[PDB]
Paper text:
We gained additional insight into how [name] positions the acceptor ubiquitin by analyzing a [name]~Ub:[name] complex that we solved at 2.5 Å resolution. Alignment to our Ub-R:[name]~Ub:[name] structure reveals that [name] and [name] are packed more closely against each other, resulting in additional contacts between the acceptor ubiquitin and [name], that position the nucleophile K63 much nearer to the active site (4.8 vs. 7.5 Å). This is achieved because [name] N123 and D124 contact ubiquitin via the amide of ubiquitin K63 and the sidechains of S57 and Q62, respectively.
Ubiquitin chains that are linked via lysine 63 (K63) are involved in endocytosis, DNA damage, and the immune response. The only E2 enzyme dedicated to K63-ubiquitination is [name] ([name]), which forms a heterodimer with either [name] ([name]) or Ube2V1 (Uev1). [name] binds and orients the acceptor ubiquitin, thereby generating specificity for K63 linkage.
Numbering used by the authors:
A (entry chain E), B (entry chain B): 5 to 145
C (entry chain H): 4 to 145
D (entry chain A): 3 to 152
E (entry chain D): 4 to 152
F (entry chain G): 1 to 152
G (entry chain C): 1 to 76
H (entry chain I): 1 to 74
I (entry chain F): 1 to 73
Write the structure that this text describes.
Amino acid sequence: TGVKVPRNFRLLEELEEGQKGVGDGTVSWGLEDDEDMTLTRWTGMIIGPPRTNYENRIYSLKVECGPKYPEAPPSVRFVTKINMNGINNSSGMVDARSIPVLAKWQNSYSIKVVLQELRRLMMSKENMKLPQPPEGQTYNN
Amino acid sequence: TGVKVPRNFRLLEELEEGQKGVGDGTVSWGLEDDEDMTLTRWTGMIIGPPRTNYENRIYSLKVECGPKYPEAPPSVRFVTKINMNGINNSSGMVDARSIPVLAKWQNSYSIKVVLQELRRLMMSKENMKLPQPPEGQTYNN
Amino acid sequence: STGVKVPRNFRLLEELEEGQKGVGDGTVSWGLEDDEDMTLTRWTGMIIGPPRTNYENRIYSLKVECGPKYPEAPPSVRFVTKINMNGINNSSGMVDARSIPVLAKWQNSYSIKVVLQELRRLMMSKENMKLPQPPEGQTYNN
Amino acid sequence: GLPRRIIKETQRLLAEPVPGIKAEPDESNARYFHVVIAGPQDSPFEGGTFKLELFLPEEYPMAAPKVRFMTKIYHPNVDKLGRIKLDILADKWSPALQIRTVLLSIQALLSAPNPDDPLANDVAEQWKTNEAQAIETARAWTRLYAMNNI
Amino acid sequence: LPRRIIKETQRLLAEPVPGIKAEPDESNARYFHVVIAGPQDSPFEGGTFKLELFLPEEYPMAAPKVRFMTKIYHPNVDKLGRIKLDILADKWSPALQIRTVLLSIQALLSAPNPDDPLANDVAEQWKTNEAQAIETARAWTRLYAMNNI
Amino acid sequence: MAGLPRRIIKETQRLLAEPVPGIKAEPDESNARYFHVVIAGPQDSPFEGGTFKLELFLPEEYPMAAPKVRFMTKIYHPNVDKLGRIKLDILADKWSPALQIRTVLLSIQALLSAPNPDDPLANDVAEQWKTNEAQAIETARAWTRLYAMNNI
Amino acid sequence: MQIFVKTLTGKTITLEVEPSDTIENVKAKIQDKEGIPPDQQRLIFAGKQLEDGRTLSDYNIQKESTLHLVLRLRGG
Amino acid sequence: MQIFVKTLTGKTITLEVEPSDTIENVKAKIQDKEGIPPDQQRLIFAGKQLEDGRTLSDYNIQKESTLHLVLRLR
Amino acid sequence: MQIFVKTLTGKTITLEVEPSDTIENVKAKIQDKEGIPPDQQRLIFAGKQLEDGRTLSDYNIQKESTLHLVLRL
C-alpha cells in the first residue's frame, strides 16, 4: 500500500510549506531554532476563530516531533494561557485523547492539520463559551 | 485592611536597608549579583550569638526570594557548615518546618527577620550547647 | 585492618600513568576522556577482539565511569561501538554488572584494566564466541 | 477600599492612554501597574519596547509613585537595577501631578538624556565623554534586551 | 519495491564507493544512511560527514533526495544540511544512478565553487577572503566532523 | 597499643595541636593515612585571597617512602600540571625519612610564593612564566579568582 | 570669623566668613568646598530656618557657632 | 681521533677528540652539537663513570670507542 | 522605439531599442538596467520563445510591445 517518507525529509517538506503561506492564514508554523538540524522544536500559531471567546486572540504553541514522526503524533503545548477542554491549565500540555487527530493519529497528517484541528475545536461548542484569562498572560517554563 | 507592596519594590527597600547598616549588626544581607534585575538571589550573614558554641563565628547563607515574595517565604541555605536543628548537614539547606518565621510566614516579614530568628534559634537550649565543626569548614554545592 | 587502603584519586592517577605506559599485551587499553578533568571520573576503554571468535580483531570502544566510591565500589561500564554479547544491552550498550563476575564480586584490588580484561575473556566464552556480530563500524547512540 | 483619585486616574489612563505607552493595573493589586514604553523615534532606543513597574504607595498622592525599569537599558538616568533618577519622583513631587505626567516625563527622558545628574555614573560619563559611542552602545543594548522579549 | 532499487542497492553494497559508506535502513529499503569521509588535500580532510538518502516513490523518474546531517561549512550546503547541485534538481536524468550522486557530492567537497551559491553568505566570503573561509571550514571540520563514531 | 606506626600518630597529633600557619590539615575519619589539606594563597603572590585544596596520603612504606600530595583546586603554576600533580624534589628522589609532613606542606606553601620555571613540569605554564611574566601573574590571579573563590 | 556647619552625616565643614555675608553667600561657599548644590541646601540654626536674603549678623550668628545642613532628599 | 656518544634516547653522535682531551672538554663538545648543558650529562665507559678532571687517555678511551650518555633529571 | 519586458515577480522595465537589435542585444540591454546576466534570462513574446540570434523584426515586435522575462533556476 505504498511506502513511508522518512522523518527528516517530511519535516523539510513541512518546513518549506510553512514558509510560503499557501492557505488559510488561521495557522502558521516554523522551526524554533532555524538552525536546529534535529528539526525537533517547532513554533505554531493559531488565530482565534470568529464567534468565540477565543476570537482574534493569537495563541502561540510549542510542537515537538519525536523520533517516530510522522508515524507517531507530536507533543503539543500551549504557551499562551487558555481554558480549553483537553488543555491543562497548570502546564498548557494537550491531552491526546481530547483531540481526534491526536487520539486517532494517522501518518497522512501534518503539523498544519494539528493546528487547524485545534482551531476547529475552538469553534466547538463546549469550548466557545468558556471563560478565558486576560490577554497577555502565559504560563512560565 | 492594608495594601500590598509588590515583590520588586519591597526587595529594593530590603536592599537599601541592607546597605545602610540600620540596627544591630548581628545580621547583614545584600544582593549576590548587584546587577541582577530579577533580585532573586541574596547573600545573608549571621554573627554567632554570645554564650554559644556558635559565638563569634561568621556564618554566610544564601537566601532566595521567589516570584511570590513576600507573600510566600524565601528559601534559605547555609553555605558555611554548622551543626543546628533544622539545618541539613550534608547540604546545608534549611527545613522550613523547624523555623517558626518560615513555618508561619507572614507578608510583614523580611529576609532580615529570617536571619535574626535563625540567630535567635542559635541561643535555644537544644542548639546552644551542640558540638560545632572547626571554623572555616563549609559545604559544597 | 589487614592492609592499607589507597584513596580514590591517588589510585586513579596510578591507573592513568600505567594506562599510558605500555602495560601488558595491548589487547586492553584505557585512559582519561578529558585529560584535564581533575575529578578523574570519566575514562575511555578499548578492547581488541580475542582470537577464534566472531569478535576477533574488531576494536571495541567503551566508557568506564569511576564514582566517588572507587575503588571500594565497582565502576559503571558501557559499550559505545555496538556488539552482541551476553550482559550487554543492545539499545544502550550498558553492561549488566551481575552478568560480569568481577563486577558481581567486586574487590578493591581490581582496576579498570582488569574489568576490560574480564570483558575480553568473556568474549572467549563458548556462549559468546559464536554469536552473530553486527557490521563493523556501527555504534550505539549518545 | 480604594481612593477615588486612584480609581479616576486609572479609568482616565485606560480610556485615554498615553501615545507610545501601555499601562494597566494588576488584576490582584490595583495600586500596581504594568507599563510598556516604546523607544522614542530618533533616539538610540527606537525599535525597543521597555518594561516598567509603577506602584502607588499607601500615601499617594501625598507621596510620589514608585517607578522602575524592568528592561535593562543604557541611559544616564537609569542604573543597573532599573531605578530612575527623576526630580518629580522625589523631592519635586507635587500631589497635583498625575500618573500620566510621570509616564510622559519618563518617555521624554528616553529621548532627552541628560548626564548633568548621574545616577549611573559610568553611563553618564561615557555620554559626556563620547556621546557617539554612548548612543551606539545604547542602540546595541536596545537591540539586545528591548527586542525579542515582548 | 521497484526492480531497479533492489539491483542498485545490491551493487552499492557489493562494490562500495571508496571514501563513502552507504546502507539501507532495516525498516526502510528506500532509506539509506551514508557516511562520506572528507577528501584529502581539502579543508575538510580528517572529517567524516553523515548524510541521509531517500529514494522517493517515483524514483528513478524523480531524483533521490539527500542531505547532510553533520553541519558543514561549504557554499553549497545550508544551515540544515540541504545540498545545492544541479544533478539533484533540474538536471537530474533517470539514467543517473545513486553511485554517481554520491560521487558528485564527494567531488563537490574538493571543488567548492561559489558562483552559484546556495548559502550565499559563506560563498561571498569564499570569494572575498577564501583563505579565512578555508580555515573556518577547517575549524568546523574539527568541531563537527570529528568525534563522530 | 597503637593503631598504625607511632610516627604517623605523633606527627598527626603535632600537626593538629600546633598547625602550620597558613595551612589547615586534618585526617580523614575513615582513613588515618589520608589527610585533607587547605593552603591559603600567600600574600605577595598571585594566589593571595584564594584557598587551595590538596590531598595527602601516607603510603604503606612511609616514612621510608615519601608522602603523596596533589592539588585538587585548579591552579596556574609552573610546578603543578593539569591534574594537580606536583613536581617537588623532596616528594621524589630527594625524600629522606627524617623529613616531616609539616615541612612538606611548608615547602609547597613556599613553592606558591617562589615559583621558578627551571623545572619542566607544566611546560607551557613555565615557558609563559618565562615569556610574559606579567601576563602569567595576571593569569594566576584570574585562576585564583576562578577556581579558589567558592571552594571553602 | 570662621563657622562650621554639621551635616546629617556627621561631617563638619569650617569656612571663614564675615558678618557681612548673606546666607546665600554661606550656601555658595559651602558648595565651593564640598560641591553640594546651593539649591539642595537648607540651613538651620537655633530653632530657625535661615533664608538666603539675610546676613549672619541678622541671625545673631556670632563666632564659631554651628549650623546644621539639611539636604533635600533627592533619591539619586 | 673520533669517538661515539650514545644516549638512551637511541641516538649516537660522533665527536672528533684527542687523547689529551678532558672529559670536561668532551662534555662541552657534546653540548655544542646537542645543546645539552654539561652539568646535566653523565658519561659512562667500560663500566666506569667518567669524571670531569681526567682525560680520555686516563680511561684508555681509544679510537672509535663508545661512551654512554645518561641525562640527569632535576 | 521603446518596449517593455515584465518579469514574473511583477515588475515592468522599459528599454529603448531598435528593430535592428538582436535579442542578445536586448538581453544585454536588460542586464545593464537590472544586473541580471543574460545567461539567466529567457524572453518570451506572443506565445513564442525568442532566440538570441534573431531580431525584433524577425518576431514582428513593434512599438511599445510587451515581452515576458522568465528567470532560469
